[PDB]
Amino acid sequence: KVCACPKILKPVCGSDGRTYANSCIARCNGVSIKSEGSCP
Amino acid sequence: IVGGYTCAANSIPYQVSLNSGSHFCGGSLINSQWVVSAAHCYKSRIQVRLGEHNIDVLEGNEQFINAAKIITHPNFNGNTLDNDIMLIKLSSPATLXSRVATVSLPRSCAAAGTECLISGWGNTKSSGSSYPSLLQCLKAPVLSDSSCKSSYPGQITGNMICVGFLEGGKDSCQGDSGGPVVCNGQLQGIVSWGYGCAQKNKPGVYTKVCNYVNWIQQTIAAN
Ligand SMILES: [Ca+2]
């Protein structure tokens, strides 16, 4: 859920249909980056 | 910025925004042609925005200038975030005025306990998410090496300082990366990383700028 991650905003879409602030915050939640950018 | 307040217009004239589609990172103007930010904010195409207060509304004070040179520290390590600093040379010099000014580099390193000002347009929530239109400000002290190291076992290099509160509640957050930490009018840190934002016993970690004054000066002189 919460992990050591850089504080950059570089949105990423998750396999769970959710967009995370960045990839580190995605992986931190064991979710895969379905795509680069907010989930459409 | 979590737990901060809306800065007064003209209070942080050295704050810039780095864009590659949208605002991704903050930065600081150190001279009319150079900006300092975090190396992890590296992109091959970057547009720097200056004189901004409300990022969602054109206010007539803004200057949009493309980066010509984008130089990350030679020893930047992407896995540990050590030497997380980057220099950007503007394609044209910024126009200095009331909303656009430079911040000074530090003569020496800050002492623990020094009060500093942190700013940025990042998330203002530690659990949910809310990004503000107006630039946020936060006053926070530099933490001692023992406290920082106690908070992040085996993760703090000699190029990192913790600035914040062990109690959690106030801190920098996603979208604040690359932003300035100014103490006594000198840029002492650059927003870098942390374990979430505003978590109890997990203060934010920042790049220790005082270790890079020579590299900065040499790089600027040679470019
Ligand atoms: Ca604006």
Same domain, yes or no: B5 and B113: yes
Q: How far is the CA of B50 from the centre of ligand 1 (A)?
A: 9
Same domain, yes or no: B115 and B8: yes
For B81-125, give the DSSP string. Answer: TBT--EEEEESSPPPPBTTB---BPPSSPPPTT-EEEEEESS-S-
Strand A33-36's sheet: what is its strand order? Answer: A19-20, A12-14, A33-36
Same domain, yes or no: B178 and B188: yes
Q: How far is the CA of B39 from the centre of ligand 1 (A)?
A: 25
Q: In Å, what is the CA distance from B136 to each residue of B26, B111, B173, B218? A: 12, 25, 11, 32
Task: Give the residue among A10, A7, A16, A22 at the shortest CA–CA distance from B189.
Answer: A7
SS3 B34: strand
Same domain, yes or no: B116 and B43: no
Six token digits for residue B64: 């949009």
Instruction: Compute the nearest-CA separation of A1 from chain B (Å).
Output: 9
Same domain, yes or no: B78 and B184: no
When divided into structural domains, chain B yields a total of 2
For chain A, domains (ranges, CATH) are 1-40 (3.30.60.30)
Task: Answer left, alpha or beta for residue B149, where phi above 0 means left and psi between -120 and 50 means alpha.
Answer: alpha
Q: Which domain does B5 fall in, by range?
A: 1-12+103-210
User: Is A29 in the B-facing interface, judged by CB distances under 8 Å?
Assistant: no
